[PDB]
Write a protein that binds this ligand. Sequence first.
Ligand code: HEC
Lengths: 115, 39, 244, 51, 49, 59, 70, 76, 64, 32
Amino acid sequence: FLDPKKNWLAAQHMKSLVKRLSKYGLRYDDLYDPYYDLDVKEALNRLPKEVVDARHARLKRAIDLSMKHEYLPEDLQAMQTPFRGYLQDMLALVKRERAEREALGGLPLYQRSIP
Amino acid sequence: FAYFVLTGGRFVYASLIRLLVLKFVLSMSASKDVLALAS
Amino acid sequence: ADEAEHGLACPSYPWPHKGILSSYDHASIRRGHQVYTEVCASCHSMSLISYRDLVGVAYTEEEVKAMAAEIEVVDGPNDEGEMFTRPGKLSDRFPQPYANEAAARFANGGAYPPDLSLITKARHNGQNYVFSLLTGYRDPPAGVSIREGLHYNPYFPGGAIAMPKMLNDGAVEYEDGTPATEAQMGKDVVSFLSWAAEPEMEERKLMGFKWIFVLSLALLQAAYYRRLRWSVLKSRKLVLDVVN
Amino acid sequence: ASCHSMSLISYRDLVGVAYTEEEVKAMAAEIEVVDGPNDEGEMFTRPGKLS
Amino acid sequence: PSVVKEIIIGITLGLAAGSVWKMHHWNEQRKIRTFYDLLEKGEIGVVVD
Amino acid sequence: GIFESLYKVVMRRNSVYVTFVIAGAFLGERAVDYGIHKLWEANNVGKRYEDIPVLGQKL
Amino acid sequence: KQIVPVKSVIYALSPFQQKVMTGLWKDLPTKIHHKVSENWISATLLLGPLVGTYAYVQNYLEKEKLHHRY
Amino acid sequence: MSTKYIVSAILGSFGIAWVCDYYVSEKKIFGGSTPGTITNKEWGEETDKKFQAWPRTAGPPVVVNPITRQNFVVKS
Amino acid sequence: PVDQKRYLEESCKPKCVKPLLEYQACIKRIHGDDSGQKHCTGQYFDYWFCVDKCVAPKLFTKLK
Amino acid sequence: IQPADVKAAAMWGVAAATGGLYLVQVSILVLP
Ligand code: HEC
């Protein structure tokens, strides 16, 4: 795996993602839907309230901008941290706990409801 | 101004609805060959 | 080969009934019905058009009554179970020249002269194709000698068609003194055939114009209504307590 | 059969009920029936069939 | 705002327009050349009868 | 303004508004139909059924 | 299907105090520029295979017909 | 601001120019004449059919504008 | 009763004489051959396509 | 309140009759 700092294509991809995410004022982790995985749900429950509330505020701002058909002003676009993640470590810990629980005879702590 | 724009569109819609309803009912009405055979 | 199989392509003639506001040339419809009756009804049939269809389109009602009274059709059983023939009325369809498809094919060398009611909608590029087919009885190219019993026609798929060159100069005498030539006769008969295939064209065009205009105005109203209802949402300022 | 008609009972209905197939075929071949236009376009007549 | 970019794109548009006009001129020249070529060595004459 | 005048006329009770709309639809449809008919007749002069020279000479 | 509150403060103006059909015309050049500069790549990937295949097909048909022309 | 006024005035100017043209050269509120070559309305017809074969004093009829009209005789 | 279509196509015959010349070239080749399938309907189609394209509007503006 | 109610009911009846005439234009009934 030669993604970062050694692949021109990967550098271009990172540039494009930074452009788009900062344009809407989002972060990469905010793209993780709790309804999608049910592990993101547990991670978001375990995260501190300040972090979760900031995530919700950023999501609401992004949806507002998407409705209005406009982007953040250049100032707030400059003051952006699209890849200052907050969810990957907790998500990995939750996945690891799930891994051991399934590894040695355990019921899942939560399951997706059949729709 | 808003209500008058809306009113113009509203009676356009009324015209459309009357057209459609009458088209269906008159289609279910009589036919030219029958009227010809009326003698 | 493939070129002759698909036939020489037909140009785009400027028909008088083409355009978002364009009507049939009704004098030309009358003239085309004359030429069809004179020369084309011997072999081809319509069988989907009543005499009453001509009333108010090309002939007056008394004229159509006389024309129908000219021909005689078989009417159902009388009080003895026998069959009889009575002059045609204003409701009878156009007469059929042959008893059935078998008789038609037998009279026309195995080839069946198609029903002409929907002929311009039953061919790709209908009206242009029919006009070109009628007018383009050309000398076959070099070294392509076609068999006896057919005629060369570049537009017909395969080049060999079964009907002979019918439209000739001076074939008919028009009522209104219009000089009868091959091109004029073709134009009139194709106008008549295109009317026969689509007798509702004028009403449909009028309805389409009126309703496209009216619905465009409705569209503007809809555009304004939506913008008005959404303007309390799109021009709103929210403070969220977050920066990055 | 000289006055009333059935016109809903085919000859094939009789096999296995009152007659055998050979008998029904012979009975059908007894009578004549008009048939659709031939290659010349005329309405001809042929001996009846089982159907 | 980039001055060199604006001048480059202007020169490029000028050359495109000139190329279109030159294609027109070349087609016209070919038509004239083939007409006279035939007029000497072909079926084409100029007097009607 | 004319908008405020017509509002004070026919936009204080919904029944009148409905009636006004009904009047508007009928009148506007008739006006558009007349205009389109005039346009059609202007565009297709000579081609009508009523003005063909042999309309009643077959008898 | 619960609703997550965000603790914002929202000011909104009534629809009858705003121009309703002017935002469509305010910035046409900027909006056209944004559309083109944001979607030229996607336009190339959409119309590219189509036009290329069409040109190839007409070219090959021309060659084939001229070759079979005796 | 004023684009309404400017465009309206431009269209009005075209209307006024049309009216003045119609009165001064179609009905000639100021006296004048019209050629016999344009009012006959069949002169252009023969002019075009003559571009097909233009008469000449010494020699058979000959064509004019052979290139720009693409009209010319064949093998003979 | 002179045919307007025939007269018009004769008039426009010298407009696009190039397909006609190609068709004549094939005619000469086929006359030289005199033994093959020898059709070359493609030249015929090209030439008559050009003539038909020419006689498109003039026919109806000349017709009654 | 009753006068206002009956006035409103009559107005709605007039609107309903106008809608009925619009849907079914009857000069045959209008003339007599
Ligand atoms: C008897 C002879 C006639 C007469 C007087 C006319 N037609 Fe034609 N026609 C006839 C036959 C036997 C056939 C079949 C040929 C075949 O399809 O192999 C046709 C065919 C047509 C067609 C169909 C062409 C096609 O489908 O590509 C048309 C459109 C047609 N005929 C028209 C037509 C018209 C308008 C006539 C009056 C001038 C006419 N035919 C006369 C036999 C005969």
